[PDB]
Amino acid sequence: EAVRRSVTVEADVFSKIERDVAKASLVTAPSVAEKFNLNVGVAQKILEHLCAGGVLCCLSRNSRLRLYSRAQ
Amino acid sequence: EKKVIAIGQKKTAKARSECMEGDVFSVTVNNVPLRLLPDDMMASKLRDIITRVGLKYFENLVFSITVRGGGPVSKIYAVRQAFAKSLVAYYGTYMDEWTRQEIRSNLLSFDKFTLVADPRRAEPKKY
Amino acid sequence: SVDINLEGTSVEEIEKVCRDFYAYAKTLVPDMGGVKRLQTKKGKITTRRSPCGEGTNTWSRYRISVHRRSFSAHLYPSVLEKFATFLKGSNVEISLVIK
Amino acid sequence: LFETFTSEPAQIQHIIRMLNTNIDGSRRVVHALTQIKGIGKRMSDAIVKRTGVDASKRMGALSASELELLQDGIQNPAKYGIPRWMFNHQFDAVDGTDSHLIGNQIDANLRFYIEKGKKMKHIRVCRLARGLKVRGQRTKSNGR
Amino acid sequence: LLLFDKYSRDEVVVNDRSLKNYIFLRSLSSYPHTASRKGSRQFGKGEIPIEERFVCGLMRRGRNSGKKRLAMAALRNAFIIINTLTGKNPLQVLVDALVNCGPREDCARIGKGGAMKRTSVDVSPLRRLNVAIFLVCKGIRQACMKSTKTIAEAIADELIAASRNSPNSFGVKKKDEIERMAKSNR
Amino acid sequence: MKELFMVRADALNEALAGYLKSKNIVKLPENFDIIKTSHGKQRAPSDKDWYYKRAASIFRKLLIAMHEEKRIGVKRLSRKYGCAKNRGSRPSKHVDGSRGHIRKIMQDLERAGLIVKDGNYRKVSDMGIIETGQLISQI
Amino acid sequence: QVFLGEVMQLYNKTGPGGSITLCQLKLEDTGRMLHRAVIGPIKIGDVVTLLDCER
RNA sequence: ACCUGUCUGGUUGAUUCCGACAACGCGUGAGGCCUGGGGUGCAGCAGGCUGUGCGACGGGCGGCGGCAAGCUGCAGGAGGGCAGGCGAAAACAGGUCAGUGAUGCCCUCAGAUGCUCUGGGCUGCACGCGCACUACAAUGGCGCGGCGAGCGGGAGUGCCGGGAGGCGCGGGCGAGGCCGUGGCGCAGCAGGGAUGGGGGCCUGGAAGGGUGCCCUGAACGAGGAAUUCCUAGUAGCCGCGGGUC
């Protein structure tokens, strides 16, 4: 079984995962990379971008893991 | 004026501490202040001693701790022993002694190695 | 300025030497420094026991350790010579530096 | 919020054909360029830094303009200010000019190497013609 | 004094009377790492804290031997994801993982004579805790090896799924597999 | 220099490296973008401004060696900048740093007057003491 | 249903390895005193959990 | 011939001891011992050094056993089986004649089985096997910043170079890693570094040796029957230094 998770964004998953992280309480960068077929590298920068917007507050800034939860 | 020196040590990590009657409480371990320690486990293993003894006993006591030798984690327990040993040695010299016996009983019941050395050394086998 | 340097492998001999020399030095001078003992320079040799390859890794460790003692003062050269005559019934190696 | 999202590209070619090699657009350019036979992880760091394309771009997202900025960067790296000692095939036996072999050039040099050696009865290619380990290696216990 | 400066060890209720003796919930350090000589006194594994007993179970399979600072950093992260996914005290969800993963009864071979018969055997509370630690630290490591899951997530995945008994967690599907072999022979 | 330590170490570094780049007192070599920085390293440094960031790290090491009242050279300094070399099937042995760029990065610290030699050892001078003093005042 | 059992008496380490010991077990509310084989490390004063549903 | 002593039982790491005893007394070994390790008393002197002592005996207490030896838990304590060292009698057709100006005997001694020189081999390779190394990666790898050991205490310095390396002065050292952070992101992939090509050097009289640079990028995705080692600062992981040179 060979997996190569897509390193692209197709303007339909970005609003899909934004709806998904607004649903969930806490999401992490590898968890969206498995639930969807994204690279965790592009998944990392998406959740930082949704931290830059008012979509999710940054929890813990560590190099091993960056944790994210929904705002308010 | 008032200054005591006590040493604590882990495996081969030796740590001096100097307790003085300074202006405000401060712990500058290895010429680095406690809030700006890069290793947080170095900082928290100092802080739980302050949490156990309580901050009221550290009113004006300035601790200039230095450490050398050993690795990262044995340096944590070197200064942690040396910080508490110099704290009780200051009260034994410059303060009232029944509080020092009160403090020593508090720490020894807390953890034995805060005030006594861990005799557990690197004891290598042969071939 | 005299530096009396003495080195020895046996310790019960080199402690008898420094004891009778300090019994000799207090007769001379009261500003004589106490006997200072430098680092015991020690060495080990690890050696296989077997003269062949039939045995287990049986390693015998032999050790040598030489003990150093020193004295420092500022005296007269005739006193240095009568110090020098005193320490020749001793098997401790003796060397002196006048700087 | 896709439109305000900027960092990673939307559409990427999955594979790129260059220098008779297929290089995946999924990899970033320094890691993508090393699929070329003759370009390692050190040479590709040199080429991207000397040419000046963005290393933080996936390779399929590159335009054709910067892609031809890379293929000439591969072909003559001495043009793009790369020092001599980082070259593949430098101080040549025949022409004596420092060069950097890419792709089929290495094996065609290698096929030439065994062919010229078997003519000259060279021992080192004779063991390589039989697949034997030809450097200082031991061949009793390992390599079997 | 609080674990990781966040979580109180005092408000952690181990409901099992069997394991209350051995799960150690006395606040001795902000970190799990207490380099105490408790293994020598023959029962002192019930005296080092349960989180220190847990992080020692992580540093496993050779390449991670002795990397306790890596493990309890990867548990410091693992308690933040746990607490903000569940609201519970992450020590309380940790002790509820082990009481839901320690096998109470086991299958073993007993015979005084040369013939040995496989019989059901009751499990000691300290062994029940020792192999509850072992089964979840196996399932944490084996689920995070060659996948996109990290070490800090697989702790959070297993200990949540162990605290609410479900066949997803590696502990309880191995705990119930062990206890089924007890009923297989009794 | 007690007040050297009373700021964050890495936060001092880009404040120091950005000072050495803005004042132009450290000069880049020709091959700066491709230096392995050790023979144990596998890649060149990924940072484009790695050269300044090291010049802040070297000048900090001379700063603390003055605080320890100790003299430091270039060859001993390269040992602080060595990694462990992946030696293939052999065990990974520690190797020394690249001495060549460290020597030129200290010579530019001599031209600025930050580092003045004392005998055969270069030492931090009073000019290096003052210019750090406005930096850590600002951090 | 699981019955918790307190160990008052330990004797007769048995089995191949010797880990298994027979322990005389007290039940709390009843007080019924029963021998049982327990595998791991046991101390007098521990409480063990039994689920045999037969004894 | 032999047996008892040298043991019914209990005990101990110990034929260690308690005890009953046709045995009684002894002796080796065991122990005692010697060295290192931790605690501190004094003394001397200047990554502190080394002399002299003290400190633990299983002493105290509780329960078993009671002429008991002892066992076991706790307190006190720095410490309650620390690590080594020497190591009985008897053996073995154990190994070493290739450590020997240790050697009997046999064989060889001028076309030598002597010595020495040069070259080659001991490094050959369809294959079988032992022990290790590096791995199969995300608990990872790579890039920077920060913090960084002990044994060993000789070595750093300035300049040239991209590195290896070079040159000139010359009392004079510190690791993997860990922490912080950036990239990669489950891929035979930035895992792995085998094999091979081209160049630069070091040592040496002489490279198949070592090192450095670039490139090529193998098997290996957890390993069959089997099988080794290990109880606490230990296994394991991780480097470092010394012998060889």
Nearest-angstrom CA–CA distance, C76 and D7: 86
Record the tokens describing residue A45, joined without a space: 């920068």
Nearest-angstrom CA–CA distance, E37 and E39: 6
- CA dihedral of residues E13, E16, E20, E23 (deg, nearest 10): -80
Answer whether E120's CB lies under 8 Å from E86's CB. no
Resolution in angstroms, to 1 decimal, for this deposition? Answer: 2.9
Cβ pair G38:E186 closer than 8 A: no
CA C89 distance to own-chain centroid: 14
CA-based Rg of chain D, rounded to a whole angstrom? Answer: 20
CA angle B53, B54, B60 (to 5 degrees): 100
CA dihedral for E21, E27, E32, E33, sign (positive or negative): negative
Asked whether residue C11, judged by its CB, lies under 7 Å from any atom of the DNA or RNA strand H, the reply is: yes
Instruction: Dump the DSSP string for F85-99.
Output: E--TTS--EE--B-H
Beta bridge partners of E122: E105, G38
Do β-strands B66-68 and C36-37 pair in parallel, antiparallel, or remain unpaired? unpaired
Nearest-angstrom CA–CA distance, F80 and F61: 9
Helix (H, G, I), strand (E, B) or coil at F120: coil
Do β-strands B61-63 and B26-29 pair in parallel, antiparallel, or remain unpaired? parallel
Answer whether F1's CB lies under 8 Å from F60's CB. no
Interacting residues of F7 by C-beta distance below 8 A, sequence separation 6+: B36, F136, F139
Taking only residues 44 to 83 of chain D, the set having a beta carbon closer than 8 angstroms to any beta carbon of chain A reads 58
Category of E59 on φ-ψ map: left (φ > 0), alpha (ψ -120 to 50) or beta:
beta
CA-based Rg of chain F, rounded to a whole angstrom? Answer: 16
Nearest-angstrom CA–CA distance, B48 and E74: 21
- Nearest Cα neighbor of B40 from F65, D98, C31, E73 is E73
Helix (H, G, I), strand (E, B) or coil at D109: helix
Nearest-angstrom CA–CA distance, E123 and B75: 40
Q: Does D85 touch chain A (CB under 8 A)?
A: no
Answer whether G48's CB lies under 8 Å from G4's CB. yes
Instruction: Dump the DSSP string for G1-55.
Output: --EEEEEEEEEEEESSSS-EEEEEEEETTT--EEEEEE-S---TT-EEEE--S--
Helix (H, G, I), strand (E, B) or coil at B120: coil
User: What method was applied to determine this entry?
Assistant: cryo-EM
For the segment 5-24 of chain D, residues whose CB is within 7 A of strand H: none
**C-alpha distances in angstroms, A3 versus A26, A39, D23?**
26, 10, 18
> Which residue in F5, F7, F8 is closest to B31 by CB distance?
F5
Answer whether D33's CB lies under 8 Å from D44's CB. yes
For the segment 98-157 of chain E, residues whose CB is within 7 A of strand H: 137, 140-141, 144-152, 154
Q: Does F70 touch chain B (CB under 8 A)?
A: no
For the segment 49-88 of chain D, residues whose CB is within 7 A of strand H: 56, 83, 85-88
Which long-range contacts (C-beta less than 8 Å, at least 24 apart) are formed by C90-96? C90/C13, C90/C17, C91/C8, C91/C10, C91/C13, C92/C6, C92/C7, C92/C8, C92/C13, C92/C14, C92/C17, C93/C6, C93/C7, C93/C8, C94/C4, C94/C5, C94/C6, C95/C5, C95/C6, C96/C2, C96/C3, C96/C4, C96/C5
Record the tokens describing residue F46, joined without a space: 């990924």
Q: Which residue has tokens 């308010």? A: A72
Instruction: Dump the DSSP string for E40-77.
Output: TTSSGGGTS-HHHHHHHHHS-TTTTTT-HHHHHHHHHH
Answer whether B11's CB lies under 8 Å from B70's CB. yes
Nearest-angstrom CA–CA distance, D122 and F13: 57
Rounded to whole angstroms, the maximal C-alpha distance in chain B is 55
CA A42 distance to own-chain centroid: 8
Record the tokens describing residue B126, joined without a space: 């042969």
- Nearest Cα neighbor of B3 from B50, B57, B61, B55 is B61
Cβ-based burial of D71 (10 A; exposed 0-12, middle 13-18, buried ≥19): middle
Helix (H, G, I), strand (E, B) or coil at C71: strand
The DSSP letter of residue D89 is B
**Residue at minimum CA to C1' distance from nucleotide H73:** E41
Residue of B nearest to E27 (CA): B110
- Nearest Cα neighbor of B32 from B23, B16, B43 is B43
Whether chains A and F touch (3+ CB pairs under 8 A) is answered by: no
Helix (H, G, I), strand (E, B) or coil at A37: coil
Record the tokens describing residue E92, joined without a space: 């309380």
Answer whether C57's CB lies under 8 Å from C90's CB. no
Answer whether D92's CB lies under 8 Å from D98's CB. yes
Q: Quick one: which H or E segment has residue E134? A: helix E125-143
Answer whether B27's CB lies under 8 Å from B34's CB. yes
Please give the backbone phi and psi of residue D58, each rounded to the nearest 5 degrees, phi first: -70, 150
Residue of G nearest to E18 (CA): G47
Nearest-angstrom CA–CA distance, E156 and E75: 9
Helix (H, G, I), strand (E, B) or coil at A59: strand
Do β-strands B3-9 and B14-21 pair in parallel, antiparallel, or remain unpaired? antiparallel
The amino acid present at E82, given as its one-letter code, is I
Helix (H, G, I), strand (E, B) or coil at A60: strand
Answer whether C42's CB lies under 8 Å from C63's CB. yes
The DSSP letter of residue D60 is G
Please give the backbone phi and psi of residue A25, each rounded to the nearest 5 degrees, phi first: -85, -55
Beta bridge partners of G23: G10, G36
The DSSP letter of residue F92 is -
- Nearest Cα neighbor of D34 from D43, F45, A41, F47 is D43
Nearest-angstrom CA–CA distance, B104 and E134: 38
Please state the length of chain G: 55
Which long-range contacts (C-beta less than 8 Å, at least 24 apart) are formed by B29-37? B29/B63, B29/B65, B29/B66, B29/B67, B29/B79, B29/B83, B30/B65, B30/B66, B30/B67, B30/B79, B31/B64, B31/B66, B31/F2, B31/F5, B31/F67, B32/F5, B33/F5, B33/F6, B36/F5, B36/F6, B36/F7, B36/F8
Answer whether E103's CB lies under 8 Å from E92's CB. no
CA-based Rg of chain E, rounded to a whole angstrom? Answer: 17
Helices (H), B1-127: 40-53, 72-94, 97-110
Measure, in angstroms, how far nucleotide H115 C1' is from residue C52 CA: 27
Nearest-angstrom CA–CA distance, B113 and B99: 20
- Nearest Cα neighbor of A44 from A27, A24, A19 is A27
Measure, in angstroms, how far nucleotide H227 C1' is from residue E63 CA: 22
CA F45 distance to own-chain centroid: 15
Interacting residues of D36 by C-beta distance below 8 A, sequence separation 6+: D18, D19, D21, D23, D74, D102, D103
Asked whether residue D139, judged by its CB, lies under 7 Å from any atom of the DNA or RNA strand H, the reply is: yes
Record the tokens describing residue D111, joined without a space: 């096929």
Q: Which bases in strand H are touched by protein, i.e. have an atom under 7 Å from a CB?
A: 37-39, 43-52, 73-74, 78-80, 82-84, 86, 94-96, 99-100, 123-130, 133-150, 152-153, 156-165, 168-169, 173-200, 208-217, 222, 232-240, 242
Count Cβ atoms below 10 Å from residue G14 Cβ, excluding itself.
15
3-class SS letters over chain C: CEEEEEEECCHHHHHHHHHHHHHHHHHHCCCCCCCEECCCEEEEEEEECCCCCCCCCCEEEEEEEEEEEEEEECCCHHHHHHHHHHCCCCCCEEEEECC
- Nearest Cα neighbor of C91 from C14, C11, C38, C2 is C14
CA-based Rg of chain C, rounded to a whole angstrom? Answer: 19
Nearest-angstrom CA–CA distance, D31 and D54: 13
Rounded to whole angstroms, the maximal C-alpha distance in chain F is 50
CA dihedral for E117, E119, E124, E125, sign (positive or negative): positive
Interacting residues of E81 by C-beta distance below 8 A, sequence separation 6+: A26, A28, A65, A67, E152, E153, E156
Helix (H, G, I), strand (E, B) or coil at A27: strand
Asked whether residue E55, judged by its CB, lies under 7 Å from any atom of the DNA or RNA strand H, the reply is: no
The DSSP letter of residue F8 is -
Measure, in angstroms, how far nucleotide H245 C1' is from residue E83 CA: 61
Q: In what order do the strands lie in the sheet with A56-61?
A: A26-28, A66-70, A56-61
Beta bridge partners of C5: C70, C95
Give F78's Cβ-side CA count (13 Å radius): 17
Q: Which residue has tokens 């290598």? A: B124
Nearest-angstrom CA–CA distance, G44 and G32: 17
Record the tokens describing residue E159, joined without a space: 């200990």
CA dihedral for B48, B51, B57, B61, sign (positive or negative): positive
**C-alpha distances in angstroms, E95 versus B95, E19, E53, E133?**
44, 9, 12, 10
- Nearest Cα neighbor of B26 from B53, B5, B50, B51 is B50
Nearest-angstrom CA–CA distance, C54 and C50: 7
Distance from CA of E179 to the nearest CA of G (A): 10
CA-based Rg of chain A, rounded to a whole angstrom? Answer: 12
Beta bridge partners of E119: E108
- Nearest Cα neighbor of C94 from C7, C13, C23 is C7
Helix (H, G, I), strand (E, B) or coil at B18: strand
Record the tokens describing residue G6, joined without a space: 């307190």
Asked whether residue F71, judged by its CB, lies under 7 Å from any atom of the DNA or RNA strand H, the reply is: yes
Instruction: Dump the DSSP string for F22-86.
Output: HTT-S---TTTTS--SBSS-SS--S-TTHHHHHHHHHHHHHHHHHHTT----SHHHHHHT--EE-
Contacts of A49 in chain D (CB under 8 A): 1, 4-7
